[PDB]
Design a protein around this nucleic acid. Sequence first.
DNA 1: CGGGCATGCCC
DNA 2: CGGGCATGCCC
Lengths: 197, 197
Amino acid sequence: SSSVPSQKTYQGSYGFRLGFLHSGTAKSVTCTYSPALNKMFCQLAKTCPVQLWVDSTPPPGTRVRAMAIYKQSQHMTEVVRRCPHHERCSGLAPPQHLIRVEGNLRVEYLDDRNTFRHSVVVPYEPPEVGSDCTTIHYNYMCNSSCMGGMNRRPILTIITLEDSSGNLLGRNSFEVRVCACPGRDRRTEEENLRKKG
Amino acid sequence: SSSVPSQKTYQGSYGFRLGFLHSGTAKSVTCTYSPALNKMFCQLAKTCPVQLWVDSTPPPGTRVRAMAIYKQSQHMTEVVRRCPHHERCSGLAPPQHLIRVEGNLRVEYLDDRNTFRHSVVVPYEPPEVGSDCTTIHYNYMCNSSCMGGMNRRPILTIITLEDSSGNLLGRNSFEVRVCACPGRDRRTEEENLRKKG
DNA sequence: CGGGCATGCCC
DNA sequence: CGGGCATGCCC
Ligand SMILES: [Zn+2]
Ligand SMILES: [Zn+2]
């Protein structure tokens, strides 16, 4: 069976979608999301807020899993991992994991025993009463360019909502470029899309 | 006592000097030496020929040691090592060593038990009869720019001629930039010296 | 091959 | 902070 996880959007019966905060205009804003590109530009090891929106309430026990895969066909079968430098200079998160969640006391880090893929899982909590969404704080612990890790290859973050039995309730994904200057790089790729895309 | 090794030239009683081969004009020539800068520009893990010239014959038992130190005052006390990526993707040479010698059956790699500095040593052989010099083939196993290793910091290679008792007979050093495009980078730094130096 | 992009860093 | 260098890589 395939060891490449699906990245196909599946908004499913709960109308699961992701949301992203607006950000400032700074060249090196800590994180900024491009709707045109469906791509987050963010700095390493800093907060990357991601909102979970649903139209209907997931059952008790639902989980929220994040996993990175390389976007390009030629790299999709290689597991996305922390580069050797950041692993050596690295609480619960194993040092080989690229994606962490901060501020959650129930985080689990998983190393799949068959596909070798890393994932990080937290329980689904429904929005607080006055609220339309639930926000998880992700961190990516290498730059996209890290030698011996992502090595400039774009990744997708796959977010899956899964019940406690392991049924797939919803799937969304967004591309990520972890970089020194998120504002600069987002503008550069939006301009490239307009001019050459 | 100091754990920073001397880099001061000491041509000594044997009139020990280093020589370098001329190279071609290519942008990415595999190695090229700048006399103006006393600096070798070379690609990683490829041959970097270095000639040993003496006016008088070293005694039997003499050794030839190579060791890297950071050139800049602010980095001189840090040991020069292979970056974590190239160490993990790495015969006798320990994977943490930046400098190797190829084609010598008597090479020794040393990790100083007090200063933690790495060195690689081969016996001195006098030039063959028709010859003015002895050539050792060094390899540098990271680029100067390697993240988590040299990290763009220029190094000096220190070459010492040492008798078997450990007396210093001669010392010379040359700066090194290990890079993708030795021809391009040598020309760039020579032009910078002329214009801004 | 040599022109020119890449992108963390400039000190 | 934003202009511009850096330098392995372009696919
Ligand atoms: Zn990294
Ligand atoms: Zn390296």
